[PDB]
Amino acid sequence: ASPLKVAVTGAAGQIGYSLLFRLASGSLLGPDRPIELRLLEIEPALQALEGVVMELDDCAFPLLSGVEIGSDPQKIFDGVSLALLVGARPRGAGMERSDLLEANGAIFTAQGKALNAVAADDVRVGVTGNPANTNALIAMTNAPDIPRERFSALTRLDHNRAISQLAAKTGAAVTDIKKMTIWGNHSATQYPDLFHAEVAGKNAAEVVNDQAWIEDEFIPTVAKRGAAIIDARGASSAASAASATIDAARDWLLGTPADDWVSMAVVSDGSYGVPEGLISSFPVTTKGGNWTIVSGLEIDEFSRGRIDKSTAELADERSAVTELGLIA
Amino acid sequence: SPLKVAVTGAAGQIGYSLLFRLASGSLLGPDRPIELRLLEIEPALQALEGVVMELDDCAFPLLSGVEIGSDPQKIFDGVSLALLVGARPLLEANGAIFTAQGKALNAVAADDVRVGVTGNPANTNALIAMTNAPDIPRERFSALTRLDHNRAISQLAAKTGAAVTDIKKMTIWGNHSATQYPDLFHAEVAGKNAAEVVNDQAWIEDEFIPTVAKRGAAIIDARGASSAASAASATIDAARDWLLGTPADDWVSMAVVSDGSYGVPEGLISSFPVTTKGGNWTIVSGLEIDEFSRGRIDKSTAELADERSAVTELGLI
Ligand code: NA
Ligand code: NA
Ligand code: NA
Ligand code: NA
Ligand code: NA
Ligand code: NA
Ligand code: NA
Ligand code: NA
Ligand code: NA
Ligand code: NA
Ligand code: NA
Ligand code: NA
Ligand code: NA
Ligand code: NA
Ligand code: NA
Ligand code: NA
Ligand code: NA
Ligand code: NA
Ligand code: NA
Ligand code: NA
Ligand code: NA
Ligand code: NA
């Protein structure tokens, strides 16, 4: 196979440090599909990025066809088929992800315009940098010649967290869990939805049989997990964010299993009462590098309220970046 | 059935880079589960809890479970692969660590255990561990020279323009130290003898060997931090090849106990060209050692013997 050209921003950062070795080892497309890494950093981090590339070379990875590094997004994104926009300022303890809306926003205006100018026709664009949904909205709107559906923000770390907590509660293997959904924003208002999930062919909410645990423990544990990692580790998630980035990109490009769906924050067409044009997390299936929102789910009153709270937040964020002039 | 894998220094930088790859399938592939048993010192256990939170958040299908602790006799119980990564960042300080860890392994590891030592000074730590485990066959102990090996492959690929897949039969001889000897005279670049391809002895001595030997310091100069991800990667490569076997047209480097082969003093843990099958290594037989290579091999094994003498004088053997 021709090498897949993959761009990674913030590539000398902590997420990048985890992610690049998984990419080069075969985690994205498997053991027979080479990858070319195109790595972006800010100028003061280029010496460190040179060091990371030395380490990549020193792994003697058979799949790594080559590496280009630089600080010019038009050079690094030239011809790329997958762009992993990870680099942005991190949050720290006591911060909400939305605290970084104005700071990180302008990065995404510029990167969307660069992608628009130079990326491969088949590009798919994943955004991990915070606040992720709004940053993906910024990038998507600044790339009018790339189809809107090519942009996604990462809610897969939230999704995976929710799988982990459900498996723990139920005594199940992670492989038993299917049809998890995270709705809305990658924030504290995210809604992890058990009511459509399955634990080995059984409805998840019925298996747990405990609405109070769902409301008082499960939802806030998942929603606030990032802050819990900051408290435990002293720094934001890195390896697990990199792992979720690989999972989301892999499923996007190679497809979801027939019996399952995943969570991706993508542009709303109004489905499920989610305001049109927001980047919001939905249950989706994928095939051929394309996603489709899962149709037909009955949204119960409790779920409805939690979804709307989260989409309300997204609408507020969208208004703020529109007022800052970052959109279009 | 999950392979029980112990990792020491598990909240360190190598560990951070290693554990997620292990759990994702890098060691045994996509259908073989693993159980992680993570050792740290007591003051690092809080941090290790945070690493386990992130492991759990990955929802890894292969990760059957995780146990953490500071007692090697608990963590190593029933393990079939022990990756001894943690060490004091010299010979004496690490001596107590590896004496204690070899004794623990001897007491509680699985019969089929293989023990890979990444923590420095790796060869002599491995020797100490092996000596302290008289009920585990000596061939189960290896020190990691795979990072040097892969670094050599990297330099040789850059010099020749070949793909890394075109590079075979690289060897690192001796100690994992500045006296290591990376041997191009038996390596092949797309079938052709590597030293004949390069055709430049001054480049070998003045550039290739010192660049390999000093690479860790070059990474630190560049990144401001040590080479954790590539060390992790080498650790996985070496353990994977040990357990699953080497390719039929290739060999790898492993530091293992010497039977005298190639003039390496018996009983030293020393890096040899090896093939693997069934979880067992065999030193590559039949290689002709030229005068230049003999001199460099003997300089390294002299250092290994000096280190063995030092730890013997300290009472660690
Ligand atoms: Na960075
Ligand atoms: Na990292
Ligand atoms: Na691949
Ligand atoms: Na490697
Ligand atoms: Na390596
Ligand atoms: Na470059
Ligand atoms: Na667009
Ligand atoms: Na709640
Ligand atoms: Na949080
Ligand atoms: Na939490
Ligand atoms: Na938590
Ligand atoms: Na609407
Ligand atoms: Na909009
Ligand atoms: Na609102
Ligand atoms: Na340790
Ligand atoms: Na380390
Ligand atoms: Na594995
Ligand atoms: Na956990
Ligand atoms: Na994850
Ligand atoms: Na041995
Ligand atoms: Na080893
Ligand atoms: Na042998």
Q: Where are the domains of chain A?
A: 1-153, 154-328
Q: Do B154 and A58 touch (CB under 8 A)?
A: yes
What's the CA gap between A169 and A163, in Å, rounded?
10
What's the CA gap between B256 and A275, in Å, rounded?
64
d(CA B142, ligand 6 centre) in Å: 36
Q: Tally the C-alpha atoms within 13 A of residue B59's C-alpha that lie toward its C-beta.
A: 26
What's the CA gap between A157 and A152, in Å, rounded?
13
Contacts for B145 with CB less than 8 Å, ≥ 6 apart: B122, B172, B176, B180, B253, B254, B255, B271
Domain B1-143 in this protein, CATH class: alpha beta
Nearest Cα residue to A19 out of A238, A249, A226: A238
Please name the residue of chain B whose CA is at the shortest distance from the CA of residue A55: B230
Chain B residues inside the 8 Å CB shell of A47? 222
What's the CA gap between A312 and A275, in Å, rounded?
9
Nearest Cα residue to A8 out of A288, A239, A246, A226: A246
In the stretch 139-168 of chain B, residues with CB closer than 8 A to chain A read 147, 150-151, 153-154, 157-158, 163-165, 167
The number of the ligand nearest the C-alpha atom of B254 reads 21
User: Candidates 3.40.228.10, 1.10.287.110, 3.30.160.100, 3.40.50.720; correct CATH number of A1-153?
Assistant: 3.40.50.720
Edge-to-edge order in the sheet of strand B3-7:
B63-69, B34-39, B3-7, B81-84, B114-117, B141-143, B252-257, B269-277, B280-283
Strand-pairing partners, residue A7, are A38, A83
**Resolution value (Å, 1 decimal):** 1.5
Please name the residue of chain A whose CA is at the shortest distance from the CA of residue B219: A51
Q: Tally the C-alpha atoms within 13 A of residue A3's C-alpha that lie toward its C-beta.
A: 18
A283 SS3 class: strand
Maximum C-alpha span of chain A: 55
* Residues in chain B after which the backbone breaks (C–N beyond 2.5 Å): 89
What's the CA gap between A230 and B308, in Å, rounded?
44
Residue type, position B305, single letter = A
Q: What angle do CA A180, A184, A189 make, to 5 degrees?
A: 100
Tell me if A266 sits within 8 A of A151, measured CB to CB.
Answer: yes
**How many other CB atoms are there within 10 angstroms of residue B71's CB atom?**
11
The number of the ligand nearest the C-alpha atom of A241 reads 19
Q: Which fold has domain A154-328?
A: L-2-Hydroxyisocaproate Dehydrogenase; Chain A, domain 2 (3.90.110)
Tell me if A271 sits within 8 A of A48, measured CB to CB.
Answer: no
Contacts for B59 with CB less than 8 Å, ≥ 6 apart: A160, A161, A163, A164, A167, A174, A177
Kindly state the tokens that stand for A28. Answer: 């994205």
Chain B residues inside the 8 Å CB shell of A239? 16-17, 19-20, 54, 58
Contacts for A312 with CB less than 8 Å, ≥ 6 apart: none
Residue A155: which H helix or E strand, with range?
Answer: none
What's the CA gap between B101 and B93, in Å, rounded?
13
Method for structure elucidation: X-ray
Torsion angle (degrees, nearest 10) of CA B198, B201, B203, B208: 80
Q: Which fold has domain B144-317?
A: L-2-Hydroxyisocaproate Dehydrogenase; Chain A, domain 2 (3.90.110)
Closest-CA distance, A243 to chain B, in angstroms, reads 6
Beta strands B141-143 and B181-183, pairing class: unpaired
Q: Do A232 and B49 touch (CB under 8 A)?
A: yes
Kindly state the tokens that stand for B314. Answer: 């300290």
Q: Do A52 and B223 touch (CB under 8 A)?
A: yes
- Residue A195 sits at the chain B interface (C-beta within 8 Å): no
In the stretch 38-67 of chain B, residues with CB closer than 8 A to chain A read 46-47, 49-51, 53-61
Tell me if A97 sits within 8 A of A186, measured CB to CB.
Answer: yes
Contacts for B56 with CB less than 8 Å, ≥ 6 apart: A164, A168, B66
| CA distances for A297 relative to A260, A270, B27, B151, B265, angstroms | 14, 14, 40, 53, 72
Give the 3-state DSSP-derived string for chain B, with helices as H, strands as E and coil as C. Answer: CCEEEEECCCCCHHHHHHHHHHHHCCCCCCCCCEEEEEECCHHHHHHHHHHHHHHHHCCCCCEEEEEEECCHHHHCCCCCEEEECCCCCCHHHHHHHHHHHHHHHHHHCCCCCEEEECCCCHHHHHHHHHHCCCCCCHHHEEECCHHHHHHHHHHHHHHHCCCHHHEECCEEEECCCCCCEEECCCCEECCEEHHHHHCCHHHHHHHHHHHHHCHHHHHHHHHCCCCHHHHHHHHHHHHHHHHHCCCCCCCEEEEEECCCHHHCCCCCEEEEEEEEECCEEEECCCCCCCHHHHHHHHHHHHHHHHHHHHHHHCCCC
Tell me if A112 sits within 8 A of A141, measured CB to CB.
Answer: yes
